[PDB]
Design a protein around this motif. Structure first.
Motif, short mmCIF file in Angstrom:
data_model
loop_
_atom_site.label_atom_id
_atom_site.label_comp_id
_atom_site.label_asym_id
_atom_site.label_seq_id
_atom_site.Cartn_x
_atom_site.Cartn_y
_atom_site.Cartn_z
N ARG B 78 -42.25 35.87 3.58
CA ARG B 78 -42.82 36.29 5.03
C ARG B 78 -42.98 35.13 6.02
N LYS B 79 -42.54 34.00 5.60
CA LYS B 79 -42.31 32.82 6.64
C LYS B 79 -41.04 33.07 7.49
N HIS B 80 -39.87 33.29 6.81
CA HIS B 80 -38.52 33.12 7.55
C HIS B 80 -38.11 34.66 7.81
N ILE B 81 -38.35 35.58 6.64
CA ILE B 81 -37.77 36.69 6.92
C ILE B 81 -38.20 37.80 7.63
N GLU B 82 -39.66 37.98 7.36
CA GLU B 82 -40.61 38.77 8.00
C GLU B 82 -40.50 38.50 9.60
N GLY B 83 -40.68 39.83 10.22
CA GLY B 83 -39.97 39.80 11.64
C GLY B 83 -38.55 39.69 11.89
N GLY B 84 -37.94 39.60 10.66
CA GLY B 84 -36.38 39.52 10.82
C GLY B 84 -35.61 40.74 11.12
N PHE B 85 -34.85 40.77 11.96
CA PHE B 85 -33.97 41.97 12.36
C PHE B 85 -32.75 41.95 11.55
N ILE B 86 -32.46 43.22 10.96
CA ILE B 86 -31.21 43.54 10.32
C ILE B 86 -30.08 43.93 11.22
N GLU B 87 -29.24 42.66 11.41
CA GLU B 87 -28.08 42.72 12.49
C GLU B 87 -27.06 43.98 11.51
N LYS B 88 -26.97 43.70 10.25
CA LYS B 88 -25.85 44.57 9.66
C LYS B 88 -26.08 44.18 8.09
N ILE B 89 -25.57 45.35 7.46
CA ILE B 89 -25.80 45.49 5.88
C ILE B 89 -24.16 45.24 5.36
N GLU B 90 -23.84 44.02 5.12
CA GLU B 90 -22.49 43.72 4.92
C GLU B 90 -22.16 43.18 3.33
N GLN B 91 -21.04 43.53 2.97
CA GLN B 91 -20.37 42.80 1.76
C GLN B 91 -19.78 41.61 1.94
N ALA B 92 -19.93 40.69 1.21
CA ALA B 92 -19.02 39.61 1.26
C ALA B 92 -17.87 39.80 0.34
N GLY B 93 -16.89 40.54 1.16
CA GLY B 93 -15.59 40.90 0.75
C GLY B 93 -15.81 42.10 -0.31
N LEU B 94 -15.71 41.90 -1.54
CA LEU B 94 -16.02 42.90 -2.52
C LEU B 94 -16.85 42.77 -3.75
N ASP B 95 -16.85 41.27 -4.15
CA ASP B 95 -17.71 40.94 -5.06
C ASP B 95 -18.98 40.98 -4.77
N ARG B 96 -19.96 40.98 -5.72
CA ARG B 96 -21.27 41.30 -5.69
C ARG B 96 -22.33 40.54 -5.00
N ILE B 97 -21.55 39.89 -3.59
CA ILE B 97 -22.78 39.24 -2.76
C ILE B 97 -22.88 40.27 -1.55
N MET B 98 -23.92 40.78 -1.58
CA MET B 98 -24.48 41.95 -0.57
C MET B 98 -24.80 40.93 0.61
N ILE B 99 -24.04 41.08 1.77
CA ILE B 99 -24.50 40.07 2.73
C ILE B 99 -25.61 40.99 3.51
N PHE B 100 -26.55 40.14 4.25
CA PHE B 100 -27.71 40.94 5.02
C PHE B 100 -27.79 39.82 6.16
N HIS B 101 -27.05 40.24 7.15
CA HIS B 101 -27.18 39.28 8.35
C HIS B 101 -28.77 39.24 9.11
N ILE B 102 -29.34 38.36 8.61
CA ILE B 102 -31.03 38.55 9.09
C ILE B 102 -31.00 37.75 10.27
N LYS B 103 -31.05 38.53 11.61
CA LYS B 103 -31.05 37.87 12.72
C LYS B 103 -32.71 37.66 12.37
N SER B 104 -33.57 36.86 13.37
CA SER B 104 -34.96 36.99 13.43
C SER B 104 -35.31 36.77 14.84
N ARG B 105 -35.87 37.78 15.67
CA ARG B 105 -36.68 37.48 16.85
C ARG B 105 -37.91 37.26 16.13
#
Lengths: 135, 535
Positions: B78-105
């Motif tokens: 709730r500190k860092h992520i809440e209010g965070g915008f989802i820029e994108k829902i990305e994979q780190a290539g193909l191994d199981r690191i599901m990137i989440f570009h958390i912008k935050s206004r």
RNA sequence: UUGGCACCUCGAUGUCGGCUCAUCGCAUCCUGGGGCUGUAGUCGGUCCCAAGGGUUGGGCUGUUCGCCCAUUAAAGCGGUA
RNA sequence: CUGGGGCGGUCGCCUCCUAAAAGGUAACGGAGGCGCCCAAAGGUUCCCUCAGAAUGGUUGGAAAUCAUUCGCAGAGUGUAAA
RNA sequence: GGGGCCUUAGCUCAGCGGGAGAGCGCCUGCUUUGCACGCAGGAGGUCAGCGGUUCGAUCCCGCUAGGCUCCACCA
């Protein structure tokens, strides 16, 4: 180890032993008593030593009606020490006597068993006493 | 095991959920994080886990929970992520690191961007808020301090590291660099591809050259239709997104991942505790059974050797008889068995004919006492053996409430350690009701607490089963046949017809010891059966 | 012995240990004579009468005490500033 | 000061027990309190009287408050003790 | 010399009268692209000994034993 759980003053003046027993000089809660002929200052360890003695000779022996309680404390200063510097520290407990006082009544078990049980009880002890029974 | 499944999930949720300001964060449950986000401009749910069995990102079914006491973990969320915008829902290539570009206004207005890598690794996954511009962990899950050999660590001061990935192709194709005659191939799928599990691998090996099938089944993943199922094949419940590859079991089509894993596993999850216990107890009744069977045949093995009693006992009697021709200082004797062998015994000079006679009687009674002790020990042992077999008799018919009930029975036996729950019944095929004594204690509750005396009772005649009763129902031909039938196909001898259950007045039904009850004064009825009538 | 008091001695009572000389006691360490024994014998253990006599030599340490080696029948325990 | 000195402890005031029923009576005896507090905690007029227990009954609850009888007295009396 | 603390699982320890247990560790099967494991379990017990306590004691009482730990002036 008989105790008073609570006390007013941990310490006392020591006290004296003159005269005779006020009350409790006769078996009436039990049947067959033992009484004093002297007096002294006595420990719960000693009286319960007698307890285990009589109750093993008898193996559950009847019922007692102990007459006493080691209300008095006594102090015992530390060792190789000089005088003064305040009264010594409380050490254990004490149970006081006057002659003619009854200590243990007995009931529920035969008189002869009583005699020998309290023989073994008596031979523990620093004092002179005798067997008693109810009127 | 690797992230082709995970990347299909990544893409099919990237199509959906981008555009989200993160609204609420909820977690009482230890590793089930419930999120709400303004995703698609909608207050939209989500579930996450990296529990050492459960890890999945789940556009989920009805969420569980709202703690009003979330972990300090969730307070960092709730500190860092809440209010965070989802820029994108990305994979780190193909191994199981599901990137989440958390912008935050965020609460300022500044556009604080970071990564939230989730190393979805099944059992031991890790949701990791990786500060992108610095690539530093700010709160993590699994440690390796590096107190021992391996690589990286949680700490929210620990700089972020990626565990060493492996020489995966991430795709005939095998023929160029490799060979599909490399050996056993599913293990090698695991070694060599990122489309991996050992099971997914071997199923691919069956999907049969092969790499056209590989890249074209990935093209089916690119079609992104994949009518899911849980293939219950031999209880193996392959949650598999196209209908079963091979092994040809079942297909339980969940149209949604939402219901696929949660309502299945959560349905299993309580039962998965039940199966932790059931399989511990599987292995353990297996043990105690075979265990003491071994120790007691071992008793017998050690037992057979020595008797050493009646030899010299009878001869002590002989010397007692001939107690007037003896010396104290002899070894030998002269003998008749009133039979007349004339044994010349040992007699122990310097020790009297009396002494050695009553010493013969002494060793006699001694071997007698030793062996009789050991034989009542072994009698206890044999009644213990069939007590295992009786425990097992009931256990083969036992349900999970009976698992717990027998855990109580083995507190009673002293063997285990974990409120009126007597027993149950079933619908007889003859339109009656048969009380199903389902255990030792359930039999006590169905028979000794529930049933009436002089009733119709039955137990599996030397088959691993439970007992039954037509309590206060004098089971006629039909009723007795149906009850004996239900037993005859509920036992572990359910294949064997003619289960000859002894029935009569329950007045004669014995009871003892403890658990030592019998049904006697009873005539046997041989039965076979079907199953579904019971319900 | 370790201790308590402060009583003689501060116009002085040399204080540890050791040497030489010793010498009194005995709840005895060896030797005398006994009785008991869970004292086969042999060795023993326990208790009693018994102080006549006797009760080693060295390494370590200032030492005492203690340890050690080898003995002895044994290698005593106290007092006497 | 000191049951030699030294460390330590105390050094004045008050209440109590020791204290031997007038009073007084020491110890590095036993125990507690003070270097204040109220301008109403005062002076005076007038007034009525407790502490707890039982009963009953909102929130009330073991315990607020409550009527209720019991109830020299168990409370209060600025503060330690008497 | 005296005072204070402590003896429970192979290890570290809680438990503190009416059921001996948490974790570390050994054994069992799960499975795990972090080789990290975790999972379920399982075994593993003179609660230091003695005595008393009780209807019964790791627990309550006393003693002993040890281990630790603190403190122990001038001739």
């Amino acid at each position: 180890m008989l105790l008073p759980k609570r006390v007013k003053y941990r310490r006392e003046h020591r006290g004296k032993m003159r005269g005779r027993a006020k009350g409790g000089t006769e078996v009436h809660f039990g049947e067959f008593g033992i009484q004093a002929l002297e007096a002294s200052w006595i420990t719960n360890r000693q009286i319960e030593a007698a307890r285990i003695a009589m109750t093993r000779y008898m193996k559950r022996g009847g019922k007692v009606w102990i007459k006493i309680f080691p209300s008095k404390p006594y102090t015992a200063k530390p060792l190789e020490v000089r005088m003064g510097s305040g009264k010594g520290a409380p050490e254990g407990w004490v149970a006081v006597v006057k002659p003619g006082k009854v200590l243990f009544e007995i009931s529920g078990v035969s008189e002869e068993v009583a005699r020998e049980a309290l023989r073994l009880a008596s031979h523990k002890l620093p004092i002179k006493t005798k067997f008693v029974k109810r009127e | 095991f690797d992230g082709m499944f995970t990347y299909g999930m990544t893409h099919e949720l990237n199509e959906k959920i981008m555009g989200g300001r993160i609204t609420k964060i909820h977690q009482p449950y230890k590793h089930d994080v419930i999120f709400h986000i303004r995703a698609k401009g909608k207050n939209q749910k989500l579930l996450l886990s990296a529990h050492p069995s459960y890890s999945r990102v789940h556009i989920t079914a009805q969420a569980y929970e709202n703690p009003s006491e979330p972990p300090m973990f969730c307070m960092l969320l709730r500190k860092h992520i809440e209010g965070g915008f989802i820029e994108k829902i990305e994979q780190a290539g193909l191994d199981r690191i599901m990137i989440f570009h958390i912008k935050s206004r965020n609460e300022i207005g500044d556009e604080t961007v970071r990564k939230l890598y989730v190393e979805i690794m099944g059992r031991h996954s890790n949701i990791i808020l990786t500060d992108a511009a610095e690539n530093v962990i700010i709160d993590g899950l699994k440690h390796l301090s590096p107190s021992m050999n391996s690589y990286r660590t949680v700490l929210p001061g620990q700089d972020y590291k990626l565990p060493p990935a492996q020489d995966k192709i991430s795709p005939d194709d095998i023929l160029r660099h490799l060979s599909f005659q490399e050996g056993r191939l599913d293990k090698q799928i695991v070694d060599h591809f990122s489309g991996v599990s050992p099971l997914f691998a071997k199923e691919a090996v069956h999907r049969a050259t092969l790499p056209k099938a590989l890249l074209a089944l990935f093209a089916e993943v690119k079609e992104h239709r994949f009518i899911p199922n849980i293939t219950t094949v031999n209880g193996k419940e392959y949650f598999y997104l196209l209908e079963l590859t091979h092994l040809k079991g079942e297909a339980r089509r969940f149209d949604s991942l939402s219901e696929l894993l949660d309502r299945f596993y959560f349905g299993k999850a309580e039962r998965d505790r039940v199966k932790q216990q059931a399989q511990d107890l599987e292995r353990f009744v297996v043990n105690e059974r075979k265990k003491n069977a071994n120790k007691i045949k071992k008793l017998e093995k050690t037992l057979e050797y020595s008797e050493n009693a009646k030899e010299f006992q009878l001869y002590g009697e002989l010397l007692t008889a001939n107690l007037y021709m003896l010396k104290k200082g002899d070894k030998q004797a002269e003998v008749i068995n009133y039979e007349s062998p004339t044994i010349t015994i040992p007699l122990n000079p310097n020790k009297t004919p009396s002494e050695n006679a009553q010493a013969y009687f002494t060793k006699y009674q001694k071997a007698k006492n030793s062996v009789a002790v050991v034989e009542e020990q072994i009698r206890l042992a044999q009644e213990e053996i069939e007590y295992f077999d009786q425990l097992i008799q009931q256990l083969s018919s036992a349900s999970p409430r009976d698992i717990s009930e027998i855990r109580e029975e083995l507190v009673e036996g002293k063997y285990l350690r974990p409120h009126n729950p007597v027993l149950e019944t079933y619908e007889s095929t003859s339109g009656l009701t048969i009380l199903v004594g389902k255990n030792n204690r359930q039999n006590e509750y169905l028979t000794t607490r529930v049933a009436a005396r002089d009733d119709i009772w039955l137990h599996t005649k030397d088959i691993p089963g439970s007992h039954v009763v037509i309590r206060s129902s004098e089971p006629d031909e039909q009723t007795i046949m149906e009850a004996a039938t239900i037993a005859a196909y509920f036992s572990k001898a359910k294949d064997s017809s003619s289960v000859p259950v002894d029935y009569t007045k329950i007045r004669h039904v014995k009871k003892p010891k403890p658990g030592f009850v019998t049904y006697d004064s009873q005539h046997t009825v041989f039965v076979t059966p079907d199953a579904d009538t019971v319900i």
